[PDB]
């Protein structure tokens, strides 16, 4: 309703996006009503119903459609929380191929774009989950939280798949028990990779702090040494100075 | 583990504590007072050496001006009375006696 629905440029662009999604996802092949369908700018009510049914079944698969879909469209949109629902009049829903299709056309686009984003919103989640399932010491923190999240979602994955078996019919015999052991090996393995990696980080750090430490204790040893030699040298010089005058005097005080 | 300092901080603390300042300072006050002692010994004895360099350079400019020159490099005394290119050379050997030496010298000076 807050959209330039009557603007011909807007209509054109949105038509393009509609066509692009329906064609990309094999709309016409999956349903032959709009076989090789291209830009309905003068739609047919039948086809409209086709498109709506397909898109919604993609949003909500399993929805039983009655034999007349025009009856369910308003309720479907009310359940979906269609934001523009107020701009649509129930009366105008029966036959939309007339004047106000400019509104209903817009609606269709809103669905497509919505669909575009839904398949995105969900896919990113799917992808995200995949990332969490395989998810210098100071710099990388929280890693333990990532391994505990891992094991939460790895135990989750394990549960869901093992159950898919448990309820499944054909497969449950050989593939079940082995599957467990296999999933179990990955765990101890990868974290063992961690353990050893950090043992090596530990020891090579030992050569870091040890190279530096050794060098340091060496220069310390140096200071101690030359400091000692310095004091000693001074003290020798002093001692000599004190003695010499003593002797000089020793021989000169005979006035006989 | 070794080739390393077991406790370096203790080593350096140690190194500071046995570095004895007041001892060396006291040795330098010592050396100053030594010098001052000498300076007074030299000095009161530089009037005794202005009286032994006047007693000696009066009896040395005088003895020397008598023509008697100690040559102790060669263990001998030179007598130059005439300064004509001829001198008398008297060895300081313990052999000759003191009376004969004296008599001889005064004979040479009387020529």
């Amino acid at each position: 309703d807050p959209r330039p629905l009557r603007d011909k440029n807007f209509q054109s662009a949105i038509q393009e996006e509609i066509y692009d999604y329906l064609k990309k996802n094999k709309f016409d092949i999956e349903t032959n009503h709009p076989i090789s369908i291209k830009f309905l700018k003068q739609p047919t009510q039948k086809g409209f119903i086709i498109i709506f049914k397909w898109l919604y079944l993609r949003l909500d698969p399993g929805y039983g459609f009655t034999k007349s879909i025009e009856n369910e469209i308003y309720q479907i949109l009310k359940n979906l929380r269609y934001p523009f629902l107020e701009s649509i009049n129930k009366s105008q829903i029966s036959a939309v191929g007339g004047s106000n299709w400019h509104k209903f056309l817009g609606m269709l686009h809103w669905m497509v774009r919505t669909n575009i984003k839904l398949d995105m919103c969900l896919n990113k989640v799917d992808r995200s989950l995949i990332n969490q399932n395989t998810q210098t010491l100071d710099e990388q923190d929280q890693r333990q939280e990532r391994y505990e999240l891992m094991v939460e979602k790895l135990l989750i994955d394990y549960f869901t798949e093992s159950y898919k078996s448990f309820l499944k019919l054909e497969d449950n015999y050989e593939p079940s028990m082995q599957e467990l052991k296999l999933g179990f090996e990955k765990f101890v393995h990868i974290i063992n990779t961690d353990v050893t990696s950090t043992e090596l980080k530990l020891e090579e750090l030992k050569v870091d702090l040890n190279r530096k430490r050794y060098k340091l204790h060496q220069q310390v040893i140096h200071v101690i040494d030359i400091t000692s030699k310095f004091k000693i040298n001074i003290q020798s010089s002093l001692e000599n100075s004190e003695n010499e005058l003593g002797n000089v005097i020793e021989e000169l005080r005979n006035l006989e | 583990k070794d080739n390393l300092l077991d406790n370096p901080v203790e080593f350096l603390k140690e190194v500071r504590e046995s570095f004895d300042i007041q001892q060396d300072v006291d040795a330098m006050k010592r050396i100053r007072h030594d010098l001052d002692v000498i300076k007074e010994e030299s000095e009161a004895r530089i009037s005794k050496e202005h009286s032994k360099v006047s007693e000696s350079n009066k009896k040395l400019k005088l003895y020397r001006s008598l023509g008697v020159i100690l040559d102790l490099e060669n263990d001998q005394v030179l007598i130059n009375r005439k300064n004509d290119g001829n001198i008398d050379i008297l060895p300081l050997d313990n052999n000759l006696s003191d009376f004969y030496k004296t008599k001889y010298i005064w004979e040479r000076l009387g020529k």
Partner: nanobody
Amino acid sequence: VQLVESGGGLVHPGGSLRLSCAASGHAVAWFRQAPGKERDFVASINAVGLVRNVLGRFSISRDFAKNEVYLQMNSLEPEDTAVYYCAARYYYDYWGQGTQVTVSS
């Protein structure tokens, strides 16, 4: 720790001598034992140069970079004849095997 002594032997009187002791493996010092007598403390030097002694004919020093202590004797006397033992402590925990010093009258 190993204490390696060197520099002893038969020496004429009035001469000079220097004994060395190298530690391998705080204070380092010298004792001595004259023939038929008890061991006697000669003197010590701490890692820093605190010297505790014996008269001016004997002088102890150290090179810390070499971990070595030195005992210098001048104008040697017949009473100096003895077995001179190097010793080292963590403050006695370590001893050398001893180094003969014989002053020939």
